[PDB]
A = this chain, B = another copy of it.
């Protein structure tokens, strides 16, 4: 109870990878022909993050070393990593012999499995009320060096007989040595601005295909596969797990709402290595050359969570309730207005939680300035250092009195109305107990459909407890009203009502008719009926995610990632 409260909850990311999404050309000089095939087997992405929410100092403590602030913590370290990210198990390759004319040109192609060029993790903040405080990879590594200078001379004399000869050798020399060390996948932090920080694990050694060669050339006849795999670490292709922390600083006493967006991604690149029939004086030897122009395809996934700066997590002290002991289940519930009511108790009721301070007062978690005073118990007042605000717990008893008069706090038998009385009467009881309660559980995580890019649009759910869709072959705009449709305008409006829908089936991907956006929205009721809007035939690289709710759930507001032309992503802010 004396320690520092925190809030933690695991947030998960899972994303099946289609073999189709891993299909690219079987050659580079011959990309037009030779067809296609999948470049990886059973690719999968599955990481688990750690989330912590804490204030920097206990409530009431003044002038400690740590400045008062609000902290959001996102960590991936030894105690929590997840499963990893996977692309393959082996290293497949095939031969491609010369088909066109062979006079002086490229005539052989060796395509292999794809090694991840770089893993990218990008964080972001919805607005600027958040700040970046600490980053565990404190910054790019500053590498020591070793420079070595060597200067010398040679003085030699030689005498010989055959004929007799005598000569003297005199020489000077100079050389400078430079050396350093380099990580294979070196950390590279990128701080775009004060509200978004991005990490990047990137190749430094053996980065290009050119460096995978163990041989320069051969004779005009040798046919062997020299693209080594012993120089390729299984870290690169088989599996990998990250390690990084980013921690967010917020304003001192700011009240509002904010969204943080975690995006994890992996970049995939096949390797295309061929030989040119260099006909030099030595002969038509096959010097080998890598193809760095080979395309790279980015695969991403997202997750989100909404933090409320008014949440009792940031008060800095474990809250308590007040069970009115005259009844079996009654507690002092306070509205936003200020009045109070005795109702059923709940361990998750923020409007019921309270804080005990150094000055013997009581503070509700609704606002730090909301405090209980005795001159008029009916409602709470903006509080100060009044003597009537201080309360004392008499030892070994259940009578919480005050300091101004010493009279105990008591409540009525039938209505529980609370007042100050010196001694209990027939119709007024004094007993009152309390205990710490969990007001620290996390709100349910709501996954994202589509692609969290572009400016985010925040609009509340409309009058019909649903939204409006302006869609055609491709989605154009979303919103809770006709004018509130952000994005395109070519799609016809549809006023859908969703009060009583079990789930939504949304199919996204590289939409062939245009862009790479979720276009298909199939809504699944409790019985299982389906209503689909969008084009499920003109879609390529389709990825689908399922989004479930309890039936008859009143959605609160919406999140719409979008550019100035179309909707890029959609999120349902649930209860």
Interface residues of chain A, those whose CB is within 8 Å of chain B, are 5-10, 12, 14, 42, 44, 46, 48, 50, 52, 62-67, 69, 78-86, 89, 131-135, 138-185, 188-195, 197, 204-205, 207, 230, 233-235, 238-241, 243, 249, 318, 321, 323, 325, 327-329, 345-347, 358-359, 384-388, 403-404, 433, 435-438, 440
**B190/A139 in contact, CB under 8 A:** no
Take A133-B80, A328-B387 as given contacts and tell me if A158 and B167 are in contact as well, using a CB distance cutoff of 8 Å: yes
Shortest distance between the CB of A491 and any CB in chain B (Å)? 33
**A155/B176 in contact, CB under 8 A:** no
CA distance A85 to B345 in the complex (A): 51
Closest to A174 in B: B153
Shortest distance between the CB of A322 and any CB in chain B (Å)? 11
6 CB < 8 A contacts A-B:
A62-B438, A86-B191, A145-B183, A155-B171, A156-B171, A157-B171
Question: How many copies of this chain?
Answer: 3
**B67/A139 in contact, CB under 8 A:** no
CA distance A238 to B85 in the complex (A): 26
Closest to A88 in B: B190
Closest 10 CB pairs of A and B: A160-B167, A156-B171, A152-B175, A140-B235, A46-B194, A84-B191, A83-B132, A148-B179, A8-B67, A63-B440
CA distance A192 to B84 in the complex (A): 9
Closest to A7 in B: B63
**B6/A193 in contact, CB under 8 A:** no
Across the interface, A8 reaches (CB within 8 A) one of B66, B143, B243, namely B66
Across the interface, A173 reaches (CB within 8 A) one of B153, B238, B321, B436, namely B153
CA distance A318 to B62 in the complex (A): 9
Shortest distance between the CB of A18 and any CB in chain B (Å)? 14
CA distance A6 to B67 in the complex (A): 10
CA distance A152 to B176 in the complex (A): 7
Take A48-B133, A86-B190, A140-B238 as given contacts and tell me if A166 and B160 are in contact as well, using a CB distance cutoff of 8 Å: yes
Shortest distance between the CB of A266 and any CB in chain B (Å)? 13
Q: Which residues of chain B are near A79, meaning CB under 8 Å?
A: 134
Q: Which residues of chain B are near A138, meaning CB under 8 Å?
A: 78, 81, 241, 243
Across the interface, A179 reaches (CB within 8 A) one of B147, B233, B321, namely B147
Shortest distance between the CB of A296 and any CB in chain B (Å)? 14
Q: Which residues of chain B are near A147, meaning CB under 8 Å?
A: 179-182, 205
**A157/B176 in contact, CB under 8 A:** no
